């Protein structure tokens, strides 16, 4: 009784942001999230424009953009609306609730004003979610909880992962899913997004480890692949994005049967 993305978008308990995402995934035949890990606004925007049709989501690290301004994020929103993808700021909120609400709403980045999705580590306990949701619920935003990590030595295992799932399922008015290496929740309303993905085997020299789209979508049951360098470092980033999209989409179709 695995449902398609389009049917999951209609589930009774679906969050509106998840529904919007699932609908555009189905419409565009993409379950690829581009990790736009660049330092220049122009490169960010040129990638978003060219790759927008191929992606369901663009994941940012706003704090590595040397020339960040709120206008850049307005331009990114225009592209997200045009090409139909969500913006996910990979901020990894990880503080007490009182602090994260200010980090989400305020400062120079004003993340909540432009990010459809953010993520949080669960290590502080559920106050991290409660603090974020005070800003994010009124702004109709969603959050992803980090249930597992791709890096060598990750401590997000075992009871830690189980705690992340419980925290999500108790905050389902705001939490729409997980960053994880596999399916961690059996509830189909929750999205599973998986980083540490490349077509070829390997890793990096700072603890990143890679698995293929077929492995993480098809065997491990995740929904969306998050891909940075496998695309970004390629010469033709559009063709690279298409190869990752086709890989992740077929793996989804073949699991769905």
Ligand X SMILES: O=c1[nH]c(=O)c2[nH+]cn([C@@H]3O[C@H](COP(=O)(O)O)[C@@H](O)[C@H]3O)c2[nH]1
Residues serving a catalytic function are 90, 92, 95
Q: Binds 185, which of ligand X, a copy of itself, ligand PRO, none (CB < 5 to 8 A, cut-off by type)?
A: none
Nearer to ligand X, 61 or 255 (CB): 61
**Cα(61)–Cα(159) distance, integer angstroms:** 28
Closest CB to ligand PRO among 7 and 96? 7
Interface region with ligand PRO, contact rule CB under 6 A, candidates 5-13, 117-125, 136-144, 183-191? 5-13
Q: Does residue 59 have a known ligand-binding role?
A: yes
Give the residue, chosen from 2, 6, 82, 256, that forms a contact with ligand PRO under the rule CB under 6 A.
Answer: 6
Rounded-to-integer distance, Cα 256 and Cα 130, Å: 35
The overall longest dimension of the chain from CA atoms, in Å, is 47
Q: Which does 201 bind (CB under 5 to 8 A by kind): ligand X, ligand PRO, a copy of itself, none?
A: none
Residue with smaller CB distance to a copy of itself, 149 or 217: 149
Rounded CA Rg of the chain: 17
Give the residue among 244, 252, 250 at the shortest CA–CA distance from 197.
244
Whether 136 and 112 have beta carbons less than 8 Å apart is answered as yes
Closest by CA position to 59, among listed 69, 71, 50, 47: 47
Which residue carries 């330092």 as its tokens? 39
Q: Which two tokens stand for residue 224?
A: 């969306």
Asked if 256 is part of the footprint of ligand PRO (rule: CB under 6 A), the reply reads no
What is the spatial distance between Cα 4 and Cα 188, in angstroms, rounded to a whole number? Answer: 10
Residues that bind ligand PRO (CB under 6 A): 6-7, 10
Residues annotated within the binding site for UMP are 35, 37, 59-61, 95, 99, 150, 208-210, 228-229
Residues that bind ligand X (CB under 6 A): 35, 37, 61, 90, 95-96, 99, 119, 146, 149-151, 179, 195-196, 208, 226-230
């Amino acid at each position: 009784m695995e449902l398609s993305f389009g049917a999951r978008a209609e589930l009774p308990r679906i969050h509106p942001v998840a529904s919007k995402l699932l609908r555009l995934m189905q419409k565009k035949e993409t379950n690829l999230c581009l990790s736009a890990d660049v330092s220049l606004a122009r490169e960010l925007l040129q990638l978003a424009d060219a790759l927008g049709p191929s992606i369901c989501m663009l994941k940012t690290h706003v704090d590595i953009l040397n020339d960040f301004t709120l206008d850049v994020m307005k331009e990114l929103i225009t592209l997200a609306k045009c090409h139909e993808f969500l913006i996910f700021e990979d901020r990894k909120f990880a503080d007490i609730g009182n602090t994260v609400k200010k980090q989400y709403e305020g400062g120079i980045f004003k993340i909540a004003s432009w990010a459809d999705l953010v993520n949080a580590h669960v290590v502080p306990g559920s106050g991290v979610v409660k603090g974020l949701q005070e800003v994010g619920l009124p702004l109709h935003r969603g959050c992803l909880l980090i249930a597992e990590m791709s890096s060598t030595g990750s401590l997000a295992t075992g009871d830690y992962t189980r705690a992340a799932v419980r925290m999500a399922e108790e905050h389902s008015e705001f939490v729409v899913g997980f960053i994880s290496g596999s399916r961690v929740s059996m509830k189909p309303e929750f999205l599973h997004l998986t980083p540490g993905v490349q077509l070829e085997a390997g890793g990096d020299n700072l603890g990143q480890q890679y698995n293929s789209p077929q492995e993480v979508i098809g065997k491990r049951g995740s929904d969306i692949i998050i891909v940075g360098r496998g695309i970004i470092s390629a010469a033709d980033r559009l063709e690279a994005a298409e190869m990752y999209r086709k890989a992740a989409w077929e793996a989804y179709l073949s699991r769905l049967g």
